Amino acid sequence: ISGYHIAEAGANPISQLAFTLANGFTYVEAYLARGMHIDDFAPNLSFFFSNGMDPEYSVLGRVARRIWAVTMRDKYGANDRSQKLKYHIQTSGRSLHAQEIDFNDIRTTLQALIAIYDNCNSLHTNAYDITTPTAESVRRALAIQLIINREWGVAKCENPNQGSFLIEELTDLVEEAVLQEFERIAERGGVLGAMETGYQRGKIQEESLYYEQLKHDGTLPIIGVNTFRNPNG
């Protein structure tokens, strides 16, 4: 179950997480209605998210894990292996730009950091470059993970997020926001019923436009793009 494309298309972190978990639960309900046991396909389910600059991304993983674990235990009565949501996080490619490509390593570092902090299962790091994935560009991207995992001091702790007032409050907020979105999809006939109306497509498109607007508006600052621009070009 992926959500990389959904976010990349323009969906904010809440929409991405909500739609993806919704899609995941859809597969579950689909397989169950084939008369299958929950402990037979749930441990095979893998997830795939995006990490951007938005605050919600910092707690995206932990929210996804809790919503899954609680529902898989209480609602579907599955075992421990099933309650464990494993996911891959890939840094936001949309968040990187063609103007001042050296700045992208800064953004890709910050995104890679909160991924590792939030104990992700798998991480991909984006290159600074538009151009083909040069062997030089891939090393700078690969070094970001190597530096954080090996050099960065805070990373030597495996649960540095836990305890933080900001993290716990954000976790609760995002979680509820996701649940509310579940209810919106549910009153549209489930995920399949919503797709019939193009609800998801519509909402993603709506948010992509809103982002692309504030970006041009100068309201949403992007360093090297709409502010602090290159004095040469």
Partner: protein
């Protein structure tokens, strides 16, 4: 939402249960023996769920586990020891998993139910106990099957 409602209620119970027994021990330290407190306390032992009661019960044993320099856990017939400490150039012991220092059993249970340690339900801080030591997949795909295969063999040499 139902799960969280339970966390709030069970915390209120665990908190009150502690507050009562705490006051009971303080009265006996002054001389006054009022078992009226104990009745309300034992009343909340039943009010607490089976799962929740065991969570608070294992909390001191949990603290002793993540306290040492290693993490002893016996699977099958053998055991799997894991280091908890990484020491800095300054000589500071950085624990892999840092436990809270709450005194209130209401907060302890609340934390254990909402955000347990990595590798424990609801796996908020991770699905595994500790991170793996040492994974980078080898992606390749272009041209015909022959070229993609050669790249696969070359990278995975």
């Amino acid at each position: 939402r139902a799960y969280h409602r339970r966390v709030v209620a069970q915390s209120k119970l665990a908190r009150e249960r502690q507050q009562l027994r705490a006051a009971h021990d303080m009265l006996q330290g002054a001389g006054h023996e009022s078992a009226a407190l104990e009745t309300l306390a034992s009343e909340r032992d039943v009010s607490l769920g089976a799962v929740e009661r065991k969570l608070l019960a294992m909390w001191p044993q949990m603290q002793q586990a993540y306290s040492g320099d290693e993490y002893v856990v016996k699977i099958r017939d053998k055991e799997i020891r894991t280091g908890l400490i990484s020491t800095t150039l300054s000589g500071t012991k950085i624990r892999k998993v840092v436990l809270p220092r709450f005194e209130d059993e209401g907060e302890i249970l609340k934390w254990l139910m909402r955000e347990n340690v990595p590798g424990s339900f609801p796996y908020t801080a991770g699905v595994f106990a500790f991170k793996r030591e040492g994974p980078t997949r080898m992606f390749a795909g272009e041209g015909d099957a022959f070229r993609t295969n050669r790249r696969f063999k070359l990278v995975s040499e």
